């Protein structure tokens, strides 16, 4: 084979349709389904799989008590077939760690996992299922990464890493990897002030990443990466439509080179597709908590600070629970453009439901279409009562 090259553009997005759904929590009521969190989706040339961080126990077991924690070090990155539940008998382990990212470059897969204490943390980069290279911690405070699919171009796969206070000016680095080796890295530049958990997609040469600002605002930062040059810039999405959670109620005028205030020290991972008049933004529906999920069509959201929605689609009702979301694309599909897709984590259990001692999620995913299709919401559908 050869490496994937990001030469096609993005398809016109008129509406979204169901791509996949595992119903992991419903199934897990009476089967050996693993407790997971922080899912993402990724596709190889002939297969799509779900990825998630496992807590090392089934939902129904007794070790699910206390899985609310983000790291226990019993945590690992696993992968299982699209729309099947993450069961104990069908999952493959990619690597071990409490934070991760992965992707396929056209020849093989790269996976990165971060493990260890909050101080002496470390990252191990795997390629073709073997460890290749490692990165130690530099700011000594929770080394962390994307929790999403990475995007490669001609073998080069840029990855965003953060190290430092989550309520302060943490540092940031971008590493450029090839076959698991480190070719270069850069300190973060541009006007974004704080970056965590980037969601990236490639298009017509170049990678766009939507990331989160957990320090000062509701206008998510964007990193624009040139994988050939191995250079980058950053800014915020100008649109007055705010996309983080919790967030302020929308203003008339947004901001571009500075975060938009009112909700400090918080936020949720999310995504956007930035393409001029073909621009779409994702966000929760409630401004107070992680519930609901919708897609809005907002022309020129990246640069127009007075732009507003002209269309949209509901994915999850505000009556349902939501979670982290992010983007992905199948870069080996036939056609003259890439079909944009995204996923949403649906969180059940703690911290919102106190009737159980665990936390878990179901996965729902959507892909775009050029047709105008109808809409339906997609609750995880589990009865919490059945676990009580």
């Amino acid at each position, epitope marked *: 084979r050869n490496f994937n090259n990001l030469t096609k553009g993005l398809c016109t997005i008129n509406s979204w349709h169901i791509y996949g759904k595992d119903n992991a929590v419903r199934i897990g009521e009476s089967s050996d389904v693993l407790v997971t969190r922080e899912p993402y989706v990724s596709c190889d040339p002939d297969e799509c799989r779900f990825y998630a961080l496992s807590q090392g126990t089934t939902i129904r077991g007794k070790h699910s008590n206390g899985t609310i924690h983000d790291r226990s070090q019993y945590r690992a990155l696993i992968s299982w077939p699209l729309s099947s539940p993450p069961t104990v008998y069908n999952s493959r382990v990619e690597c071990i760690g409490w934070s991760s990212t992965s992707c396929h470059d056209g020849k093989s897969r790269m996976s990165i996992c971060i493990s260890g204490p909050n101080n002496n943390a470390s990252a191990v980069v795997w390629y073709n299922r073997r460890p290749v290279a490692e990165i130690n911690t530099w700011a000594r405070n929770i080394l962390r990464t994307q929790e999403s699919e990475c995007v490669c171009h001609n073998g080069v796969c840029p990855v965003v890493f953060t190290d430092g206070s989550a309520t302060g000016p943490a540092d940031t680095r971008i590493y450029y990897f090839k076959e698991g080796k480190i070719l270069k890295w850069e300190s973060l530049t541009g006007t974004a002030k704080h970056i965590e958990e980037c969601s990236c997609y490639g298009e017509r040469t170049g990678i766009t990443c939507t990331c989160r600002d957990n320090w000062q605002g509701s206008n998510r930062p964007v990193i624009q990466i040139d994988p050939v040059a191995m250079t980058h810039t950053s800014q915020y999405i100008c649109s007055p439509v705010l996309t983080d959670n919790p967030r*302020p*109620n*929308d*203003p*008339n*005028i*947004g*901001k571009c080179n*500075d975060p*938009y*205030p*009112g*909700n400090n020290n918080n936020g949720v991972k999310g995504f956007s597709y930035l393409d001029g008049a073909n621009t779409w933004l994702g966000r929760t529906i409630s401004t107070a908590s992680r519930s609901g999920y919708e897609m809005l069509k907002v022309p020129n959201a990246l640069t127009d*600070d007075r732009s507003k929605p002209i269309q949209g689609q509901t994915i999850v009702l505000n009556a349902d629970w939501s979670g982290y979301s992010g983007s992905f694309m199948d870069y080996w599909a036939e056609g003259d453009c890439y079909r944009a897709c995204f996923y949403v984590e649906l969180i059940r259990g703690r911290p919102k439901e106190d009737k159980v001692w665990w936390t878990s999620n179901s996965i729902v995913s959507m892909c775009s279409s050029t047709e105008f299709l109808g809409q339906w919401n997609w609750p995880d559908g589990a009865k919490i009562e059945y676990f009580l």
Partner: antibody
Amino acid sequence: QVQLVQSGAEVKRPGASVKVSCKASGYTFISYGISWVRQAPGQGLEWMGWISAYNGNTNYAQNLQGRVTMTTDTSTSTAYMELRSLRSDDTAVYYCARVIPGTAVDYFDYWGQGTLVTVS
Amino acid sequence: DIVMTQSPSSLSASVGDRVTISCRASQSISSYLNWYQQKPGKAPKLLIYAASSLQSGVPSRFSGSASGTDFTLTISSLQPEDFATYYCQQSYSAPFTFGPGTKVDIER
């Protein structure tokens, strides 16, 4: 915690100028715009003007032009406004406020306590 | 001259008694209208911006909407603490202007 702190009350005789400070805290000073309003006793809020966050271009209320100037000191995170050639009817409480876009006006959310200036 | 009026200029109501205050712009200012609350001796507080967006920290009892150039602020129940002069601000274009304000007093 975002706060705006203004200079205390002063009394001037007509023809004098007055400079009123407003110190910012809790946020990056240079990222937000500053504006002023004044409230004469028994009156509503009269907009004085608005100064842009990054370049200080300013915009003065027309009825005040020729008597008013605005400036900021980014090293002390302090905004200043000055009126010249004061008259007895310029008695008012002057308030400083912060505006969300720092490059456009859309919603002044933080207010100082107000500075009373008496002209007599 | 960006012109706006308030109506009622004054009113009163018993605590717990729901009220509405209106503002009318001459110009087609669209969504660019904010509402402020001022108590004696204090700098004005914000309640609503961009016509209907509530400011975080402001009680849920406050809400508003607009049609044409007519904007309203209303409440659900009337709080013992919300007797104040309310003002509309036209943020649409400089010079920015305020209406004269509406005073809500306590019914006696």
